[PDB]
Symmetry: D2
Subunit: 124 residues, 4 copies
């Protein structure tokens, strides 16, 4: 899935996720979000199962973005946890957690949760 | 929080999270889980807000473990999303998502969710 | 504007489960749930709540409900809660995320909760 | 063993919110919820469900409930569902994770859900 996972992906929001799957199970690349307090590209890193089952299961993976770059800092980080599914129209199916820095009076409301699905089709 | 975040942490399960905060916002290190289909250490990587607010807020961060090493492969990955809180007894407060590789008939049940709190106190 | 009639009826989700719901005048949700997935058979009681006076700005209507997976046929020692919102219009949807908690011992509690997302559409 | 009396009563959580619940003989949960956090004032109706015949192996009792954040004082256009389990014994607890969904437009829907975890303990 190295060849499969590596590429430019787009989620249902129009966000762009450019990723490289390393030989050692590493994930690196960039994330540009179409939503929220975000501007231009952000660094990401993660990990994926570099030896998945050969039974029709997807390939487990996850990656993190801390929303700081040279343009903006949203004092937050998102983690996507999901799996890659290969074939004709390959998909990456994820759920995510977005934690913002918070005070102890704020902490109960510090984490947003959602789900993103990624394909390699360039939106229009 | 570079000096603060870097260290050996332990969660409520007795798991060991050894991490280094890089200068560029990188997180690296190892994770050994006291629970589940896991054995000895796993590679992790993530990101943290390397320039947090100076207002009493925590430092947003996240990191990923793919549960494959040279001992075992659980065909799953966990992402922890949370924040670091410094001071006398520093804590890392997280929520997490654990996705396993799944078939399309299995996918509805592929993701576990929980919360881990980390301190630098060595259990007994 | 209030969505008593928009919400009340029969819905299916993407697994083929059947959600039969009545939205009461006072914010109550009642009905039955038949799951096409998991350790479930036939219909289960559900109860929930919805915002009986939503904003007029085009926002959806917040709601939630619970199924405990015990009926006269089977008992899966677990409960799901769906949290999400009703969105009216030509193709109405109920968009949800859910938490499915199983009875667990202390040793198994870390793995006691599944998380997912279901979209419901209404049928005549 | 069934926990009608174990669950029924007044509980507080770690924010200082007050959860007043009656577990009915047929699996129903009813009561009120007063939150010490957020856009909330005084008591809100809740309804939920619990496993009325849990396993006898030491596992807790699965349950869930919903609050919609409209009462006679305030309407926060949102609903929380708590999913978790009751654990009896000398220090009984209700351990939950929760999803809090707010009414959202299509532009804001990606940010419409908060996630967290509450532990409840019972008071005389
Ligand atoms: O907007 C961002 C950074 C952009 C995240 C974009 C998200 S990532 C998941 C989804 N998928 C995408 O592709 N794009 C979106 N961060 C906010 C979070 C909420 N914030 C607070 C404020 C106060 N308290 C709590 C939280 C303020 C900062
Ligand atoms: O046990 C692991 C790997 C160890 C994860 C340990 C977890 S990480 C969050 C928590 N915090 C820790 O410190 N430790 C625990 N993975 C399972 C997941 C559930 N599995 C399935 C099987 C079939 N369908 C769906 C899921 C099988 C593989
Ligand atoms: O299968 C069911 C009951 C049917 C749930 C149906 C689910 S509701 C959300 C989704 N939307 C639907 O329409 N259908 C599915 N319960 C299992 C869950 C797995 N179980 C454990 C045990 C321990 N740890 C983790 C999980 C034990 C029992
Ligand atoms: O504050 C409340 C109602 C009070 C909820 C109390 C919560 S229940 C879970 C936790 N346990 C408790 O005991 N107390 C707290 N609702 C807000 C939430 C933030 N809101 C948005 C809007 C858009 N996107 C995301 C969030 C708008 C309205």
């Amino acid at each position: 899935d190295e060849a499969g996972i590596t590429g430019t992906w787009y989620n249902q929001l129009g966000s762009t996720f450019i990723v490289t799957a390393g030989a050692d199970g590493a994930l690196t690349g960039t994330y540009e979000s179409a939503a929220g307090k975000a501007e231009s590209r952000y660094v990401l890193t993660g990990r994926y199962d570099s030896a998945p089952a050969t039974d029709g299961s997807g390939t487990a993976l996850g990656w993190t973005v801390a929303w700081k770059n040279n343009y903006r800092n949203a004092h937050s980080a998102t983690t996507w946890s999901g799996q890659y599914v290969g074939g004709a129209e390959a998909r990456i199916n994820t759920q995510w957690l977005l934690t913002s820095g918070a005070t102890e009076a704020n902490g109960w409301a510090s984490t947003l949760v959602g789900h993103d699905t990624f394909t390699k089709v360039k939106p229009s």
